[PDB]
Each structure stands twice: as C-alpha cells, then as structure tokens.
Amino acid sequence: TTLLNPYFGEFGGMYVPQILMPALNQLEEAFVSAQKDPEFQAQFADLLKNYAGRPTALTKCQNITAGTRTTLYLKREDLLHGGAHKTNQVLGQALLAKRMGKSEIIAETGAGQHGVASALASALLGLKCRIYMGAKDVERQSPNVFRMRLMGAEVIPVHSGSATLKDACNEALRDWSGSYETAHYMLGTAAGPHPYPTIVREFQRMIGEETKAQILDKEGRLPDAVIACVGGGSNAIGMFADFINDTSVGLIGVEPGGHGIETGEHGAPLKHGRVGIYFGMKAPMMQTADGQIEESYSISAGLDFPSVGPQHAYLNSIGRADYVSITDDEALEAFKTLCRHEGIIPALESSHALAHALKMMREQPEKEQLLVVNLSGRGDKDIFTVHDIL
Amino acid sequence: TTLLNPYFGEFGGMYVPQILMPALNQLEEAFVSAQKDPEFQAQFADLLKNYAGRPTALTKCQNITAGTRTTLYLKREDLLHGGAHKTNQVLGQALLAKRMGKSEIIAETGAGQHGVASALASALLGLKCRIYMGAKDVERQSPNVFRMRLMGAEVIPVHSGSATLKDACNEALRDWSGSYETAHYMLGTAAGPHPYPTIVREFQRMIGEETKAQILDKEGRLPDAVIACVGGGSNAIGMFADFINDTSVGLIGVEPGGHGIETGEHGAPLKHGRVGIYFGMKAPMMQTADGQIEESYSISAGLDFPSVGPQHAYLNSIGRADYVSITDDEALEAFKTLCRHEGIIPALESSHALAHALKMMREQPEKEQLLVVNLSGRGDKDIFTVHDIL
Amino acid sequence: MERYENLFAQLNDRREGAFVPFVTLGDPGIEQSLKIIDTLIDAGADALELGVPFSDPLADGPTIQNANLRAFAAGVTPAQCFEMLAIIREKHPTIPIGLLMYANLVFNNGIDAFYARCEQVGVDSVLVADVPVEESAPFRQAALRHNIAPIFICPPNADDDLLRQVASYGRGYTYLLSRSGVTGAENRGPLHHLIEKLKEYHAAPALQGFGISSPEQVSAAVRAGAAGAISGSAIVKIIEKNLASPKQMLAELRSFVSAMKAASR
Amino acid sequence: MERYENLFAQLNDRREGAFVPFVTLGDPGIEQSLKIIDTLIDAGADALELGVPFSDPLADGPTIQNANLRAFAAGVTPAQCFEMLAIIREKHPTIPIGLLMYANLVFNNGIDAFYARCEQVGVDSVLVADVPVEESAPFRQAALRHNIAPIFICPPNADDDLLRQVASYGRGYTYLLSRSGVTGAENRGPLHHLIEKLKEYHAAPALQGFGISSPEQVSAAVRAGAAGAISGSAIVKIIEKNLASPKQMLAELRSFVSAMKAASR
Ligand SMILES: O=P(O)(O)OCCCc1c[nH]c2ccccc12
Ligand SMILES: O=P(O)(O)OCCCc1c[nH]c2ccccc12
Ligand SMILES: *Cc1c(COP(=O)(O)O)cnc(C)c1O
Numbered sequence A, B: 001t002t003l004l005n006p007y008f009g010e011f012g013g014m015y016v017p018q019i020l021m022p023a024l025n026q027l028e029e030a031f032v033s034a035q036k037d038p039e040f041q042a043q044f045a046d047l048l049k050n051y052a053g054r055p056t057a058l059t060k061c062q063n064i065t066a067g068t069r070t071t072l073y074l075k076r077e078d079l080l081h082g083g084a085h086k087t088n089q090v091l092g093q094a095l096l097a098k099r100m101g102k103s104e105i106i107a108e109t110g111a112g113q114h115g116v117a118s119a120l121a122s123a124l125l126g127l128k129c130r131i132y133m134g135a136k137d138v139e140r141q142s143p144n145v146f147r148m149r150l151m152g153a154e155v156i157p158v159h160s161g162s163a164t165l166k167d168a169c170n171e172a173l174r175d176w177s178g179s180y181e182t183a184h185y186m187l188g189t190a191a192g193p194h195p196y197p198t199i200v201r202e203f204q205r206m207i208g209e210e211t212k213a214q215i216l217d218k219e220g221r222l223p224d225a226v227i228a229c230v231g232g233g234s235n236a237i238g239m240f241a242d243f244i245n246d247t248s249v250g251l252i253g254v255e256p257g258g259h260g261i262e263t264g265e266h267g268a269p270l271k272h273g274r275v276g277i278y279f280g281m282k283a284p285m286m287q288t289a290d291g292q293i294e295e296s297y298s299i300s301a302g303l304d305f306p307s308v309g310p311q312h313a314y315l316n317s318i319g320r321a322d323y324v325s326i327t328d329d330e331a332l333e334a335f336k337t338l339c340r341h342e343g344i345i346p347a348l349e350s351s352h353a354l355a356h357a358l359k360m361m362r363e364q365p366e367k368e369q370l371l372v373v374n375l376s377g378r379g380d381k382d383i384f385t386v387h388d389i390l
Numbered sequence C, D: 001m002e003r004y005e006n007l008f009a010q011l012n013d014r015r016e017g018a019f020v021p022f023v024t025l026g027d028p029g030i031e032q033s034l035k036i037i038d039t040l041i042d043a044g045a046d047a048l049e050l051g052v053p054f055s056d057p058l059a060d061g062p063t064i065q066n067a068n069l070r071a072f073a074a075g076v077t078p079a080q081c082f083e084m085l086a087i088i089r090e091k092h093p094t095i096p097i098g099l100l101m102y103a104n105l106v107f108n109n110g111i112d113a114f115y116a117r118c119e120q121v122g123v124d125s126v127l128v129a130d131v132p133v134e135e136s137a138p139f140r141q142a143a144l145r146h147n148i149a150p151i152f153i154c155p156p157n158a159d160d161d162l163l164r165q166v167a168s169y170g171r172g173y174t175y176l177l178s179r180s181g182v183t184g185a186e187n188r189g190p191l192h193h194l195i196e197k198l199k200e201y202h203a204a205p206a207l208q209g210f211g212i213s214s215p216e217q218v219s220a221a222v223r224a225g226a227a228g229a230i231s232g233s234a235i236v237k238i239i240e241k242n243l244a245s246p247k248q249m250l251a252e253l254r255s256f257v258s259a260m261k262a263a264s265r
C-alpha cells in the first residue's frame, strides 16, 4: 500500500526484500508530509540559497554557435557547491533523514561525486555518514575518497561482484536491511525502489524551474529543447520535470555510447538494454542473455549506473522524451570545445549532453533552435583523464 | 601627470621604465572613461551575473562557532566560476583591453589561478592570451598549466632569477615593454604600478558591496570585522573597500606566517618587511639587507607575492586596517576544521583568513562578535598538498 | 505435486521438525555440488533450499556472496542449474526442492516460462528474495498455474495485515526470518507470537531462517512452534573451508547435517 | 667634477663620437671583471656604463639577465661593486663612469646615501632604469647635491613635454633609446627628429642605446646627430662565449671595442 504511485507505466516498483518495505513506506510518508510542510520547504530553500549557491546561472554561449541559427544556453550546475547538481538532492534527503529522527546516513558512489555530496551534507547537518564504493572505484578515485574522509565520512570499499557501482548499490541495501531503524539510505540518483525516483526528481526539480524562469526572462519564450546526460537520471529529470507539461519543449536525454553502441561497450540501457528487475525496480538494464547484470562502460566514470530511472523509461515509451547516445570521442570533442570557446571546463558526464546539442546545431546549421544544455557539473576532476587521452 | 592619485600615502607610484609610461597613462584614461560608461558597467555586470555566477552566497557557519559568542559568515568566492575571486577582475580587465582596442593579453601567475582566470576570460572574450609562469611553478602546477592550454592560452615558463612569481612578473613587464601597442598586461593583484592597485580594487569591490547588503539583510547591522588573506592584496581590498568609511567595521588582513615569523620563512612583508621599490611600486618588500628581492614562503602557493599592494600598506599606516599573520599549521587546522564541520573545502590561501577568525573566537569565546571571512577560493586544488602533509 | 505437504505430515507423525540445508547450485563446481547435495540428503536433510548463482545477491552476506563467486568462477549458469535440478529429482523422488531466486532471473525471459521450467524439472517451490508481497501478483499466479509453491518471507516483526497476506499468498512453507539483515552464520537472531498468528491464519508451516548454525537453534525453533529450520551460511562455510579436500568436505558436511537433523527430533 | 663635459668637448674637437661599452660589475668574477674593464678602456672605450647585479632586472633581455646571474654566482654584492668602482677610478682618473641601477638598490638604504657613496668613489652619473621622470624628483635632487649627473631615458617616440623634461632634468648625457623592449643585441632599433629637439632644448649630449652591436650602427648614430653610442649585450656575449678561456675573452673584447671605437671617427 502506498500514498503515491510507485510506477511510471510499466516501470518502477518496490522490488526489495520484505524486510525493507517498512523503511520505504516510512520514507514515502515522511516525504509526502515534508512536501506540505512550509518549515521544511523554507529550511531546504535556505540551504539551497545560502549554502549551495542557488540559483545557478543560465549562460548564453555565443562563441560556440557563431554562424548558425542555434542559440545555446548552459544551466550552470557546475557552479553549485560541490561542483555538480548532486548537492541539491542530498540536502533535501538529509533534511528528510532528520525529520524521521535518523542520525546516520548510508550512500553508494561510483566515481565519488555522490559520496562527496553525501558527506558534505552530512557534515553540515550533523549526520554520521558511511559510503559504500566498489574497490575498483576506490582505487581510481583517490581524490574523492580523501574529500569524503576530510568531511568526516567513513568510506567502505566493496569487493564483491564487479567491485564497482552496482556492487556498492547492493552493499548499501544489505546494510540498510539491518540498520534502517537508525540510518537513512541516501540513494544517489532518480532510480531504485519507490519512493526514490520520485523524491530525487522533486529534490532536483529546481533545475528546470529556474531554467524556465531564466529563459523566459532572457528570450521571452520556452526552449525548443532541453538536453541532459543520463547516467541514473537525476540531473535530467531535474531539468525535465517542470517542462513535462509544456508539450512544445523537447526533452532529450543522452546516454553514454562508450566506444560505440555496436561494440557493446556502452552505458545506454534505456535504448539498448532489456527490461529487468534489479536495484529495487523494473527498468531497462545492461544484462546478459541469461539475466546477469553487467556494468555500463563510458569514458565518464559518473555515467556508470547500469540501468536508468523508471520515469525516463516511461517518458520514452510514450514519446514525451527522446533518448540518444554520444560516444567517448564525441564527448571529448565537446569538452575541448567548451574549454576553448567559452572558458568553462565541463564534467565529462555533462559533455555528453553538450555533444548532442553540438550535433543538433552542426547537422542543420540553418535550423532556428533555442537549446538549453544542463551543465550538470564542472570538469576539473576530468583534466587528468583528458590529458592522458590526448 | 595622471587623472587619479598614484599613491596611498607614501606607498604606490609608477616605478616603471619610461617606455611603459604611455601604456599606464592610456590604461588609466580608459579605466576612468569605462567607470563612467553605463554600457561598460552593464556589460561587466552581465558577465559577472550570467557567466561568473554573482552574487556569491554569504554562508553562516553555526557548527564552527557553537558554544561561543562569535557569529561567523563566509563570503563564498569559492563558488565563483573558476573557484576563486580572481575571476571578477580579469573579466573587467579583459573588457578594458577591448575598450582600448587591444587584441592580446599578457598575464603573470604563481600557483596558476590567475593564469587560469586570465585564460578563461580571454577565451570568452576573443583575446589571445599568453601567460608567464616561473619554471619552478610550472613544474609544480601541471593541472593549472593544462587548464590554461585547454582554454587556448600560451604558457611560457620563466627560468630567470628564482624561476617563480616575481620572475614571471619581471618577464610580463619585459614583454609589455615591447608589445604594449597590441597587448594589455592583465596584472593579477592589487599591486604593481598605478593604475593597477586602483583598477583591481574597483573590479573586486563587489565582494564587499554584496557582503554589506547580505549581512544587513541577515543580521540588520554591519560586521564587527571583515577578515581576508593577503598575498598581493586583491581579495582583501575587494572585501574591505566598501567598508573603509564604516569606521566601526574592523578590517583585518592576514599574511602568511609560513614556518613562523621568527624563522624568516614567511610571506608577511607588510608587517615584517622593509619598504622598497620593485614591480613598479614603493611598498613593503621581502628583501635582503642589501636590497635584493626575495621570495615569500607559505604552505599556500598562492600567497607568494613577495610584496603587498600599496593601499594595504597605507591603510595599516593610518590604523584603519590591522594586519596579522597565520602559520602553515594554523592554516592547515582551519582547512581541516571547515571541511569537517561545514562540508566546505577552502583554499589554503583562504584558510589563513579563517584561521585568524578561529583564533579571534577561541581566544575570547565569550566576546560577542560578528565576523565575516572572505572565502577567496575553493581548496580542491590543495587536497594533494594537505593529504601529503597529514 | 504435494511434496511439502507429504513431508510435513510425515514429520508431524514422528514429532520431528524439518532440517533444510541451503547451498548454491554449482558451488564449487557442478560435479562437486551434485556430490554435496547427495551427501546432504544421505546425512538427513528433509528438504533442500537451492540458490541459482546471480550477479547481485542483495539479500546475502559474504558467505553466500562467495558461494556465488565460486559458482561463477566455474561458469555455472541458470541453464546448467536446471540440468542439475532435473538430475537431483531423478535420483530423489520425494524430497521437497525449493529454489532461492533473485527476481531478474525469474522475470528475464518470462515469469510464466520460469515457473513452467521449474515444474518440468520437478522443483516444488520458489522464494524470490527481492519480490515483496506487494509486487508478488504475477509471480504467485504463475507459480500456482504450474503447481509451484510461491514462498514468502515473514519479517521478525511483521504486522497483522502482512501476516494475513503471507498466510494467504504462500504455499508449501512460510519462510520465517530470524532477524533483519542478510544471510550469515555469524549473526544469530522470540518468534512465538508470529508463529501463532501464522497458524491462526492457516499459513503454510513455518521454516525459520537466517543465522541458524547450531543444533540447539534447530531444537529451539521447533520448540517455539516452527515446523523446521533452514541453514545456509553454516553449510556453505564447510564447503569454503575444505575446497582443497573434497573428501573431507563431504565428511564434514555429513557430520554437520547429521547433528542438525538429530536436534530436530 | 665635469668628466662628461670634458669628454664631449674633447670628442667634438676631434669630430668623434663616443663609444661606451656596458658590462655588469663582477661578471664573471671580481678579478676578471676588473681585467675586462681595463681591456675595454685600453681598447678605446671613451666612457663606461656599469651595472650593479640586481635580483630583478626588468629592463634587461637574456644576455644581461645572465650576466647578473653569473655575478651573483660569484657572490657579487653592491658593496663589492663600490670597492671595484673605487679601484677603477684610482687607475683611470678621467674616464666618465656611469652606473645603470635598479631603483631598489638606490633607495634601499637611503637615496641621499647612495649618491654620496657614488661621489666618494668617483662615479659620474647614475641611470635608474625603473624611475621615470614622473618619479624622479628625489633621485635627481640627491644626484645634483652630490655632483652626480642623473641620466634619463628618452623613448624612441617621446612627445614634446617629455623631451623638455628630459632636457631639463638630466645632466652629463641623455640616454636615447633605439627602440621599445629591453636590452638585447639580437633586436636592432630614424631618431634624427628626437635628436634635434633635444639639442633645441639644450639637453645633455645624446648616447644611443639598445641593440647596438656593429660598427656601422656606431657610425649611423653619430651621423644622425647623437654624440655616441652605448653597447652592452654585444660586449656581454663575448664574456659569455669565452668563460672557459679568460685570455681569448680579453682578446675578443679588445678586437670588438677597437672596431666599434674606430667607427666613431
Ligand atoms: O543460514 P543463513 O543465515 O545463511 O540463511 C540462509 C537462508 C536461505 C537463504 C539463502 N539466501 C537467501 C536470501 C534471502 C532469503 C533466504 C536465503
Ligand atoms: O646593447 P644593449 O641592447 O644590451 O643595451 C645596453 C644599454 C645599457 C643598459 C644595460 N641595461 C640597461 C637597462 C636599461 C637601460 C639601459 C641599459
Ligand atoms: C553523477 C553525475 C551525473 C550522472 O548522474 P545522473 O543521476 O544521471 O544525473 C551527471 N553529471 C554529473 C556532473 C554527475 O556528477
């Protein structure tokens, strides 16, 4: 029994062991109550404004579009405290944990940004944070691991299975299965069992709300399309949400194409996977013919969730949103182009969204189009990766 | 002959070879004209808002001050595009270069932040940028050097003298001495020959203007003191300027004490140097008994300017501002404390200002005081340094 | 078929509880796993609970995580598991055989097809660890259409509505959790009131599981009103400890199962 | 004293221009530098321009940057430079000796004291490279009080007001820049109109400097109306090239200075 619908069409649900159902129901109830509580809303708004730096800028990129009929704006989540949009929702989830009387936080992380975000929120709000991270990721993300520890969080390497994000997801749920009375599981994307896809969207929806107000102020009309990368789905659903009912606005999600869809080395389950049940939800998955879950591959370590949020699978199914992919090389070219022409170093994740907008522009340069790319994070973290490739 | 006063009491002036006087006079005239031009002001304001992210937040730090009568706010220049306050003034200087019809930019850098800031501004505004950096700094700042190159700037190592910041300062002036007709010298701090100390202050003064409005909104009164680190003097004069005439507001500048003033291994020329003439100005300098210029030492590579802006020397002389020092160990402790208790990783430069506020609080915990620390930059860049020390 | 019903009736006639070991099919290889299973049966197992290696076993602690890893190292697939199940049933006609599955393996290529394959090889029940009663409709319906008992877990704190649903939805046996958390012999888990409410609602006989690793826990479960007990991690550890000595592995499995079964009398 | 006035009068009586080499005092060591200087004089130098090693010579290109580095490697200090200057004057009573200084070295321990020390050792002029006319008051006043000529640079494009100030403020000689930039023999720099305006305003005789490295440039400067030419980087390069052969260094310095001085006739 739930207060809200756990499904988006066929996708979603609450596929967790029975022992975890009370925790999900408690979380859903706390969330519905918080959404109607003006005190919770004001506290969240105050943290977003005065701690995290909202609203974030909406930057026009004239140098990149010169000579074409494309007008391109970047929603600057790269300027949010922490350097990525993840900060928005961890603040909200930390306030939910405190509303329920929880004192501890559990979080999973792949490349480490969600771990850092969870740790900073926990440090600010007096919560004891523990983060699960696949051992292969721990080895490749020393900087983020050190940040988490500076911020007082415990980082626990996970060596089971592939020792990467999905394995950390499993371990977080294993721990929660025994610790839910005292700990809240701060899931890092708009995926997992209900109510997570819903909560994460609502705690990221200010991205699209601000973008709408900003583009109306600057252009007097809505965008032709808003474009966002899709790892698990949080930055994209945060950008898309406020525009879902604006039927003229295209919603374009960009999954990582890795070395190319035909190689099988990609992270594009929405368009190139098969529906399965894993991580508490029914959604398109990267999986073997037999049903074993596989990893997503991308040059961008943050586009590693091996499935996708259920709301995206649903929006695709009804034709409201369109999903495409961008390869490692396309993303790298977009990264270089933004650095050189706008003086902004984008995260490689976000570079996937930018790359698709660049293709929209370049393929039809005399098409009049007003586009917004969600620049989900800054790319300082990726300079070593890019340097080594070049 | 000048339009504006080149001196702050005894300090300042225009001590450059005669060949460079026309460039300084031209720059001063262009600046006076720009300051009265509503179109220039609007263009600068638009870049600050929509590209760089102003206004920056003013964050209250309740966890750090718990149990004391100190209320501490942080002015969040760490959230500015680029991660430090340097971005404000390079945007303004790039607009001045374009106003004068210049197409090229020269800039010096020590730790690299000013080089990155100059490069991003130049990339955005269509200027060809070349940056001089001491070879010892180039070797220790690979990340920043790569950022500059991604942004299209030319990085030129300087091997003369100590191969560090002062040497890069000399080389920038050597180049300008032959290229001023086509290039603007984008000096990186509120120092050097007039009109630089003046221009840099005016292009950083929004820090203090915003802080004043923010603290009035949040506390209904002005701070008891505003505290800022002092390398060359730009972030501090940007915070102080709007409060100079508010006599009740203390202005506290914090120079790096390095291993301790008594060791001689520090970067605190204002309080522990001797007046000299170098880098186009008369100001307190780190120098030998014979008059040879020496380097400043600090755990923080960005507090390396071996002198200090003339306006600070002046404000000290009349007793309007007070200058103190903070050692490497004090700065490191402040860095750790902010990470752990507020989830904010501060630049080691800025950590010097924070450390002094912490001492103000801790030495007299029942003293009622409302303090603002200028958090001049983020400390992601310093995590390796800190990790290695710990 | 009615294998659980026949077993529990026989056990009740003997005033005995059921002792049901759990192992991962194919750990540490297909041949050794078939030998392990025959040894468990010969040593006194009343029924079997058998896991199919899955990439992400989120209800399992390290011991069973490592059994899954060993099986995968030997290339074990669900298809090979079903070939094993057919052979096990061909040797042992009456022992109840229950599978412990993760949802993706059941849903993957069709829920109905999965339950039909179970029926074909002679499996008696399926417990899908990550399908709560709230999501169970298609699974339980398919199980029932193919004469498979769908097994549901009763948390050590389930409320009345949940007890009624578990009693109504399940068949064969009711899985009674000893505690929160995941599988593991290192964490030991009063269940009398849950046991009574289940009997009141005419639920399938309860088998207590999680942390059962000693004879006295088997006797305690039965004394509390459960029909028996399941032990997995304690069994799997014997495999793990004796990988280099297959013979000693079988001897130690035999000794442990014999001691656990004796405690059910 | 009036050493520049006496020199220029003598040169004018002979219809000759002045050839004035520049070297960094103490490069590559005190003893070798004293030998180099005596060789420059014996080879025909009419006057000397001498730099005091400074940490940050921002008006100098690489050649003189490296001369400063060599002198520092030999531990040369301003105090040792003044001991050298006294010895040079003791050997050579009439040659005009001009210093090329950076402001901090003059201001450091007192402007007046610096000019008094120059007077004591017998220096005739001081050119402070980074003190423009606009900041020159205390320097020029102190120079004049101690019978030292303050030298000012006239840019290759100076306007009328600047020409008038340079003419009024300077003494001894007027330094005429061949071009923008910094010292260097690799970059060669019409100065006739500036030369005429200086004569109109009764400025001290002009010595052209920057990039002078060949005899034909000496003759050209003089033909243009300058009283002579200063050559630094070309001289310093001879030191740099012959560090390992002190004797060859002196021979090559002699040949170069002789050729440059001959062109002034
Ligand atoms: O003895 P233990 O603690 O290993 O429990 C073993 C119970 C059978 C079992 C193995 N894996 C599972 C996943 C979910 C529910 C039950 C199981
Ligand atoms: O022959 P060049 O080009 O080395 O010029 C040498 C002129 C003397 C000289 C040496 N260093 C200086 C700094 C400023 C002005 C003049 C000088
Ligand atoms: C984590 C991350 C992503 C991907 O996660 P989503 O939930 O799909 O948004 C994208 N961009 C950045 C900068 C990230 O840190």
Ligand SMILES: *Cc1c(COP(=O)(O)O)cnc(C)c1O
Pocket (backbone or CB within 6 Å): B083, B084, B085, B086, B113, B114, B188, B189, B190, B229, B230, B231, B232, B233, B234, B235, B236, B302, B303, B347, B349, B350, B376, B377, B378
């Ligand atoms: C460069 C820098 C400084 C020091 O320079 P000032 O001109 O003294 O402000 C301080 N903080 C940061 C973050 C810097 O990047």
Ligand code: NA
Pocket (backbone or CB within 6 Å): A230, A231, A232, A267, A268, A269, A296, A303, A304, A305, A306, A307, A308
């Ligand atoms: Na994905």
Ligand code: NA
Pocket (backbone or CB within 6 Å): B230, B231, B232, B267, B268, B269, B296, B303, B304, B305, B306, B307, B308
């Ligand atoms: Na300084």
